[PDB]
Amino acid sequence: CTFKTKTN
Amino acid sequence: KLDIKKTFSNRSDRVKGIDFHPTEPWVLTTLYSGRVELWNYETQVEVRSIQVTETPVRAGKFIARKNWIIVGSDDFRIRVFNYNTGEKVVDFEAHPDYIRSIAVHPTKPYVLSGSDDLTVKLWNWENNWALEQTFEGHEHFVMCVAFNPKDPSTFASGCLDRTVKVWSLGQSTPNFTLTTGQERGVNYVDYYPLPDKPYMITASDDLTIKIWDYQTKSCVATLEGHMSNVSFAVFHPTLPIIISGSEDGTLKIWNSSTYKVEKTLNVGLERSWCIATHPTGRKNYIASGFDNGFTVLSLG
């Protein structure tokens, strides 16, 4: 995926 | 060289923050569920639990000299609780975005918070928790803040912008900026605690841990031992080792002289997110928080 924002 | 023993393991919702109390046999854990817990790992009894919020609580530290815990959460708030009575001490909006990390000054009444709002902020509990300074310059989420234990008028921030900045309290511009070459950004920064080496260490999504000399502003070593994002890497206070943890589910103990992995531990709690070491090296205790709970280990 293009983005993996850090939410976990 | 290491006789590692499992002291206590507890299953829970994802543990995002963890810290040891310096004089009581306790760890604090902060959970993705919004709950925070205090455990006695020697008797294996929960001392206290608080449902702080419904959002994740990513950051938590003891302020033992005040009988407090301080926590930071995704609802933008810093909250402080007295651990003896459970009473909330203060509750304020600290940043307009997630709080990733909190550090507590060892002698002055100051706390630093690092945020997705691109800043670090300094709060003074002897001025009614006033915002005393905002440190600006980072260009992505600030993931980790740490005072230099040998010089706590200075501190480091690690950032997804691929830099570590070292700052001086009372000064608006960084002392310097280290470009880590960790192209996926920095998740964590930690200082070596002893005077024999002016070293810091960074952990990255790029699978690497890097050791930096903060005087020469140079990279001493790159340590690659994980298969997924490295959540943290820290120097142990009393043993010549580094401990890292990863979304690959492992903890690794590295020899701090040879930079080799000496032990790989799978505690079976899935992904690793956070780390703490007992501040005076009592039983050489370390503790790590994971998707499925936390574990406290003694090293011999």
Residue numbers in the entry:
A (entry chain P): 1 to 8
B (entry chain A): 2 to 301
Pull verbatim passages from the article behind this deposition.
COPI mediates retrograde trafficking from the Golgi to the endoplasmic reticulum (ER) and within the Golgi stack, sorting transmembrane proteins bearing C-terminal KKxx or KxKxx motifs. The heptameric COPI complex (α/β/β'/γ/δ/ε/ζ) is recruited en bloc onto Golgi membranes (Hara-Kuge et al., 1994) but can be divided conceptually into two subcomplexes. The α/β'/ε B-subcomplex has been likened to clathrin because α-COP, β'-COP, and clathrin contain N-terminal WD-repeat (also referred to as β-propeller) domains and C-terminal α-solenoid domains and because recent studies have suggested that β'-COP, like clathrin, can form trimers. We demonstrate that N-terminal WD-repeat domains of α- and β'-COP directly bind dilysine motifs and establish the molecular bases for the interactions using X-ray crystallography, structure-directed mutagenesis, and isothermal titration calorimetry (ITC).
As a result, we used an untagged β'1-304 construct in all further studies and subsequently obtained structures of β'1-304 in complex with CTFKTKTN and CTFKKTN peptides. Because both structures reveal the same mode of binding via the carboxy terminii and -3 lysines of motifs, we present here the structure of β'1-304 with its preferred ligand, CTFKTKTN. All eight residues of the peptide are visible in the 1.8 Å resolution complex. Interaction between β'1-304 and the KxKxx motif is mediated primarily by electrostatic contacts. The peptide carboxy terminus is located on a positively charged patch formed by guanidinium groups of R15 and R59 and the amino group of K17 in the center of the top surface of the WD-repeat domain. The -3 lysine interacts with a negatively charged patch formed from carboxylate groups of D206 and E248. In a negative patch formed by D98 and D117, a lysine residue (K261) from a symmetry copy of the domain has displaced the -5 lysine found in the peptide motif. The second critical crystal contact is a disulfide bond formed by oxidation between the peptide cysteine and C220 in a symmetry copy of β'1-304. The final key structural feature is the location of the -2, -3, and -4 carbonyl groups of the motif, which project down into a basic groove. The structure of KxKxx motifs bound to the N-terminal WD-repeat domain of β'-COP identifies electrostatic contacts between the motif and complementary patches at the center of the β'-COP propeller.
